[PDB]
Amino acid sequence: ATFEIVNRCSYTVWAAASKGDAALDAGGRQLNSGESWTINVEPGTNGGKIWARTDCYFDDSGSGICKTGDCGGLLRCKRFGRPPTTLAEFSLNQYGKDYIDISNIKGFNVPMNFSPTTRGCRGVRCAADIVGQCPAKLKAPGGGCNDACTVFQTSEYCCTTGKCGPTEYSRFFKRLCPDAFSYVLDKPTTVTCPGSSNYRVTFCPTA
């Protein structure tokens, strides 16, 4: 229920936390380089996500724009953010267990490590330089690395059938981050944790 969101990047990020229809805790906060933000998530939260936003501008009421991960121009996110966005996904207290993962299905903007701060399971990590190695057709002009579905809107990339396979692009994401979801029907890299665990999301976990 406790998530410490740490920004080890050299640049300011704007952390966001939402379960799709509502904000988790405040829903969003500015994180300068090195700052930590502890948030509390309801037990039993299904389908929550934490991500980082890049190059944000907000007014005095918390309205503005982010060049990655914008959630309707809000500082305190109540909706999911705009791709490209590296996703820390979690479902808490699901029949006794927690389930965590990192997803590149909505693209990649900032590296992250998603680890438990309590005993019982391992962490996941996507820290490679996906933005620097991004294929030309996927690069967001000011947003990092898009996913194939965001760029091309085809059944194969978006898995609207529910019977899809890997591509060039998913395979690039999976080559740079094997621990993260590259496409929808990817072999699950989901980690099972003891119910009611606590976690740390670290942006730019490495150098």
HEC string for 47-87: CEEEEEEEEEEECCCCEEEEEECCCCCECCCCCCCCCCCCE
| Other beta carbons less than 10 A from residue 163's beta carbon | 9
d(CA 122, CA 35) in angstroms, rounded, equals 24
Cβ contacts of residue 27 below 8 Å, gap of 6+? 16, 17, 18, 74, 76, 77, 78
With a CB cutoff of 8 Å and minimum separation 6, the contacts of 30 are 12, 13, 14, 15, 56, 75
Q: After which residues is the chain broken (C to N over 2.5 A)?
A: none
Q: Are 87 and 102 in contact (CB under 8 A)?
A: yes
Category of 151 on φ-ψ map: left (φ > 0), alpha (ψ -120 to 50) or beta: alpha
Distance from the first to the final alpha carbon of the chain = 28
Specify whether the CB–CB gap between 7 and 13 falls below 8 A. yes
Can you tell me the distance from the alpha carbon of 138 to that of 199, in angstroms, rounded to the nearest whole number?
A: 31
Residue 113 CA, chain-centre distance (Å), reads 10
If DSSP states are collapsed to H, E and C, what string results for the chain?
CEEEEEECCCCCEEEEEECCCCEEEEEEEEECCCCEEEEECCCCCCCEEEEEEEEEEECCCCEEEEEECCCCCECCCCCCCCCCCCEEEEEEEECCEEEEEEECCCCECCCEEEEECCCCCCCEEECCCCCCCCCHHHEECCCEECCHHHHHCCHHHHCCCCCCCCCHHHHHHHHHCCCEECCCCCCCCCEEEECCCCEEEEECCCC
Burial of residue 156, with CB atoms counted within 10 A of its CB: 0-12 exposed, 13-18 middle, 19 or more buried:
middle
Q: Which residues contact 39 (CB under 8 A, 6 or more apart)?
A: 2, 3, 5, 17, 24, 25, 26
- Strand-pairing partners, residue 98, are 193
- Note if the bond before 84 is cis, omega within 30 degrees: yes
Pairing type for strands 191-194 and 112-116 reads unpaired
Q: What is the rounded CA–CA span in Å between residue 140 and residue 154?
A: 18
**What's the CA gap between 130 and 107, in Å, rounded?**
9
Q: What residue ranges do the domains of the chain occupy?
A: 1-207
Question: Determination technique for this PDB entry?
Answer: X-ray
Residue 149 has phi, psi (to 5 degrees) of: -65, -40
On the 0-12 / 13-18 / 19+ scale of CB atoms within 10 A, 93 is middle
97-103/180-181 β-pairing: parallel
For residue 153, give every residue at least 6 positions away whose Cβ sits within 8 Å of its Cβ, in sequence order, or none. none
- How many other C-beta atoms can be found within 10 angstroms of the C-beta atom of residue 204? 19
What the block records as the tokens of 43 is 């037990």
Nearest to 56 by CA among 23, 86, 12, 26: 12
